[PDB]
Amino acid sequence: GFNCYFPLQSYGFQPTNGVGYQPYRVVVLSFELLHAPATVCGPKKSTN
């Protein structure tokens, strides 16, 4: 009502919507370094 607005607002997604209105998917990957041995490592090359 008056002086009372919903905390959440929806979005309008349609195929005919503009590029700014076009839906986008976003992923964030965060790196941390504590006083612990590394448990996530990249691939290590191996020769025959």
Binding site for other proteins (CB under 8 A): 34-37, 39
Q: Which is nearer to other proteins, 8 or 36 (CB)?
A: 36
Single-letter code of the amino acid located at 24: Y
| Choice between 25 and 35, CB closer to other proteins | 35
Q: How far is the CB of 44 from other proteins (least distance, A)?
A: 17
Tokens of 11: 């979005």
d(Cα 11, Cα 21) in Å, to the nearest integer?
9
Return the number of the residue (12 or 37) whose C-beta is nearest other proteins: 37
